[PDB]
Amino acid sequence: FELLELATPYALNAVSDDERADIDRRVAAAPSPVAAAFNDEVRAVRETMAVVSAATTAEPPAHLRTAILDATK
Amino acid sequence: DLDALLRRVAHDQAAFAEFYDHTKSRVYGLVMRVLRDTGYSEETTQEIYLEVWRNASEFDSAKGSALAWLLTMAHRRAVDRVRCEAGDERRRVTECLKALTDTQRQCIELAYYGGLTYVEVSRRLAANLSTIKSRMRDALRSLRNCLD
Numbered sequence: 499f500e501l502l503e504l505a506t507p508y509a510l511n512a513v514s515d516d517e518r519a520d521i522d523r524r525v526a527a528a529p530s531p532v533a534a535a536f537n538d539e540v541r542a543v544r545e546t547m548a549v550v551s552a553a554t555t556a557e558p559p560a561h562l563r564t565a566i567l568d569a570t571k
Numbered sequence: 572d573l574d575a576l577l578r579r580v581a582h583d584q585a586a587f588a589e590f591y592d593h594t595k596s597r598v599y600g601l602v603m604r605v606l607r608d609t610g611y612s613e614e615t616t617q618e619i620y621l622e623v624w625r626n627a628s629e630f631d632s633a634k635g636s637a638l639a640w641l642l643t644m645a646h647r648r649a650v651d652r653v654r655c656e657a658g659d660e661r662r663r664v665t666e667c668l669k670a671l672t673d674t675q676r677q678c679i680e681l682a683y684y685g686g687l688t689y690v691e692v693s694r695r696l697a698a699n700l701s702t703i704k705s706r707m708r709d710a711l712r713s714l715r716n717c718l719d
Contacts, residue, residue: 503701506707506711507704510646511646511647511650512682512687513688514690517688517690541635541639542715544640545635546715546718547683548638548641548642549664550664550718551638552661553661553668554597554601554603555600555661556596557596557600562613562616562617566616566620569620
C-alpha cells in the first residue's frame with residue numbers, strides 16, 4: 499500500500515539510483531498480489547508517457563540513422 | 572506491429588531500420604527536451620538504439636508495449652545524463668497536459684522533463700513526500716483518463 503505510492507515516481511525515473519535499488523529490493527520481497535499491483539501501476543504510467551511523447555516530437559538529422567544502423571555490425 | 576518489429580531485432584534484421592524509422596522523432600524529441608543540446612542529444616539517441624539492439628531479447632510484450640519499453644529506457648538515459656553530469660496526436664496530448672491543474676502540470680514538468688526526483692520536487696515546492704507522491708499519481712491518472 500505504501501509501496502504502491504512509489505510506483506508512479508519509479509515509472510517516471512523520478513527516484514535516485516539509491517532509492518530505485520531499494521524499491522526493486524522491496525517489490526522483490528513483496529507478496530505476489532502486492533508486486534503485481536505495483537508493476538501494473540508502473541506499466542500504466544510508462545504507456546501514458548509513451549503516448550505523451552507525441553507532444554515533444556522532433557526530427558533527428560539523417561546522419562544519425564547512418565551511424566545507428568551501422569553500429570549493428 | 573511495433574512489438575513484432577522489436578521481436579524481430581533479436582539476432583539481426585532490417586526491422587531495426589524500420590523500428591528506428593518509426594520511433595526516431597519521438598525518442599530524439601524527448602532527449603532534446605531533457606538535455607537541450609543537439610550534440611549530446613544525438614550521442615544519447617545512439618546509445619539508446621544501441622541498447623535497443625543489444626537488450627531487445629529482454630523485451631516481453633506481455634509486460635508492456637515496445638513503444639513504452641523504448642521511451643522508458645530513453646528517458647532513463649537522458650535524465651541520468653542530467654543528474655550524473657502526426658501533429659494531430661501532438662496537439663491531442665498537449666490539450667490533456669494543458670487540462671491538468673497547475674500543481675499537477677508542475678509535477679510532471681519538474682520530475683519528468685526537469686529530471687528531478689520526487690524528493691527534490693518536495694523540497695523545491697515546500698511540500699511533504701506524501702503530497703508530491705499523491706500529486707504525481709493524480710497528474711498521471713488525469714492524463715491516462717484524458718488520453719482515453
